[PDB]
Amino acid sequence: MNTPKEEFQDWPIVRIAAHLPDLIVYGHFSPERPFMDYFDGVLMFVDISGFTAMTEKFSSAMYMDRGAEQLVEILNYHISAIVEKVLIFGGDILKFAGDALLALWRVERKQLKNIITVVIKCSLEIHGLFETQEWEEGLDIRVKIGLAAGHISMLVFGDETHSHFLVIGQAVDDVRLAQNMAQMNDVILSPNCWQLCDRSMIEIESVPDQRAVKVNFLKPPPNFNFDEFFTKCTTFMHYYPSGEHKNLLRLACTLKPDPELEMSLQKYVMESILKQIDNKQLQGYLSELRPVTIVFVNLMFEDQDKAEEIGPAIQDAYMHITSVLKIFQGQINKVFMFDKGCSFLCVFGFPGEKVPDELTHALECAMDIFDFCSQVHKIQTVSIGVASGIVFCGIVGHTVRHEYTVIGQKVNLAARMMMYYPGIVTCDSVTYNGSNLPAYFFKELPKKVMKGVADSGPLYQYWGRTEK
Ligand SMILES: FC(F)(F)c1n[nH]cc1-c1ccccc1
């Protein structure tokens, strides 16, 4: 008999899995919310600020109405190369933001030392991608990399239809801190990373007023062979593609239909993405430069790392946020940790979710969220930034690992406003002026210099309907 080859690998469940890390795809955990788990690992945070900064050049009339299509194509071209590097070095891409990719190498404690060496090598090879690269002279199409290692907690929260996950704890905080010390082309190790690493492998230098260190060189011992060392490390990599599947970038490409598994995984993925996955919408429909309102919610806790207290608090906040967003077809685009705080990137006006009065509604939603979350047990401070304007939306990353992402100056502005004006609801000038709401519902705020924003415009606090 003939033996025709090729397994079919283009099933909905495989397409859904592209949008999720192995941490979730192979997680098999309780559908109970919140769910927390604890493990150890090495984290890599790749700052792709330099790439995502391209949204405003692709806004030019020079792109003739194909700015979004050109932006997604060039971003995915460069980001795909980073993703392939991470995946081939055995890492799990946890999440994309419109500023960073976070990857994880989960291993037992005994293996942290050797896995840091693998992760450092990967980091140097990522820098290597961009060594002789730029567009229109453009100073830096380069990245900055922070590495951390140690204890990691995972939180999964959500309701019967949607799930979100976050990683939290000191290593997560550390990787953020390490990456923001980095200059372009740097690899910064967290203090704990540097304490756990194989010091014979590397030459480092001090970072002033910091215990974190910069990798100058990976200079292995004389008889060292990276390929034989990496092979030994794969013993500890549960899902590293191997044998008949050594030609695949992800074991997840081999997932077969499994309705119980697909029911679980689809909860993490936006319905408009599932529509495309199901071939019920054109594959190009979600790449767009779209006017939206960003509502960026930051929740601060007394404790940053103890998942046991913050997990219920985030779950409670989530149940409220999702009810409020439902009314106006808002979506949670991303949730992540930023310096102790849990941040929800909410978007009003995603594709096929157009509202007329997006602005009064976004403000009213923000205040509702603010008021409810302020009364949630263990939430110390709620801060919300509301900014409106044109943002790029699109599925960003590699064919085998990508996520829908929103990128733009207005996203960065809402993010900065919630950090620089903590404990209040703030909005930009577009939102304030567009709402037509009486001027006394607002307070005009002092101008603050915010890292990464060049002239925010007048900013306002949404004070609300009453003096009280
Ligand atoms: F992966 C999570 F869950 F999204 C996360 N948890 N903590 C930080 C992050 C994060 C990830 C990517 C960019 C920025 C932050």
Annotated ligand binding at 99? The verdict is yes
Cα–Cα distance for residue pair 420/416, rounded to 1 Å: 6
- Please provide residue 135's backbone torsions phi and psi, each rounded to the nearest 5 degrees: -120, 140
Residue 74 burial (CB count, 10 A): 15
The reply to whether 52 sits in an annotated binding site is yes
The closest alpha carbon to 394, from 310, 272, 279, 280, belongs to 272
Query: How far apart are the C-alpha atoms of 417 and 419, rounded to whole Å?
Result: 5
Alpha-helix runs per DSSP H in 182-284: 191-196, 226-234, 259-266, 271-277
> Which residue's alpha carbon is nearest to atom 10 within ligand 1?
336
AA identity, residue 332: I
Q: Which helix (H) or strand (E) holds 359?
A: helix 358-374
Cα 280 from Cα 352, distance rounded (Å): 13
- Kindly give the number of the ligand 1 atom that is closest to the alpha carbon of 97: 13
**Cis link prior to 259 (omega < 30° from 0)?**
no
Please answer whether residues 404 and 270 qualify as being in contact, where contact means their C-beta atoms are separated by less than 8 angstroms: yes
Closest CA to 147 of 169, 179, 184: 179
> Residue 93 in 3-state DSSP?
strand
The terminus-to-terminus CA distance of the chain in angstroms comes to 82
- Pocket around ligand 1 at a 6 A CB cut-off: 94-95, 97, 100, 102, 165-167, 172, 336-337
- Closest residue (by CA) to atom 4 of ligand 1? 336
Q: SS3 of 431, please? A: helix
CA distance 421 to 278: 42
- HEC profile of 108-175: CHHHHHHHHHHHHHHHHHHHHHCCCCCCCCCCCCCCEEEEEEEEEEEEEEECCCCEEEEEECHHHHHH
Resolution (A): 1.7
Determined by which method?
X-ray
DSSP E strand boundaries for 353-414 = 379-398, 401-407
- Closest C-alpha residue for ligand 1 atom 15: 336
What is the residue whose two structure tokens read 């002026």? 433
* Cross-strand pairs, 444: 460
Comparing CA positions, the residue from 466, 339, 441, 340 lying closest to residue 386 is 441
Domains annotated on the chain, with CATH: 34-252 (3.30.70.1230), 285-468 (3.30.70.1230)
Residue 66 is assigned to a ligand binding site: no
Give the span between the Cα atoms of 54 and 65, in whole angstroms: 15
Q: Is 299 helix (H, G, I), strand (E, B) or coil?
A: strand
Measured N-to-C along each axis, helices 358-374 and 307-328 cross at an angle, to the nearest 10 degrees, of 150
R_g of the chain computed on alpha carbons = 22
| Contact between 150 and 177 (Cβ < 8 Å) | no
User: Of the candidates 337, 333, 321, 419, which has an alpha carbon nearest to the alpha carbon of residue 372?
Assistant: 321
Reported for 90-93, long-range contacts at CB under 8 A and 24+ positions apart, including other chains, are: 90/118, 90/230, 90/233, 90/234, 90/237, 90/240, 91/44, 91/119, 91/122, 92/21, 92/22, 92/23, 92/239, 93/21, 93/397, 93/401
Tell me if 441 sits within 8 A of 433, measured CB to CB: no
HSE-CB at 184 with a 13 A cutoff on CA atoms is 11
Contact 411, 53 (CB under 8 A): no
CA of 253 to the centre of ligand 1 (A): 23
**360-363 own/partner pairs: CB under 8 Å, 24+ apart:** 360/435, 360/436, 360/437, 361/328, 362/293, 362/295, 362/328, 362/330, 362/386, 362/388, 362/431, 363/425, 363/427, 363/431, 363/435, 363/437, 363/462
d(CA 449, ligand 1 centre) in Å:
25
Ligand 1, atom 9: closest residue by C-alpha: 336
- Residue 236: phi and psi, rounded to 5, are -95, 5
Residue 412 marked in a binding site: yes
The H or E element that residue 366 is part of is helix 358-374
Please give the Cα distance from 436 to 357 (Å, whole number).
10
Closest ligand 1 atom to 334 CA: 4
Distance 131 CA to ligand 1 centre (A): 26
Find out whether 104 and 91 touch, Cβ atoms under 8 Å.
yes
Determine the length of the chain.
468
Task: Give the whole-angstrom CA distance, residue 272 versus residue 263.
Answer: 16
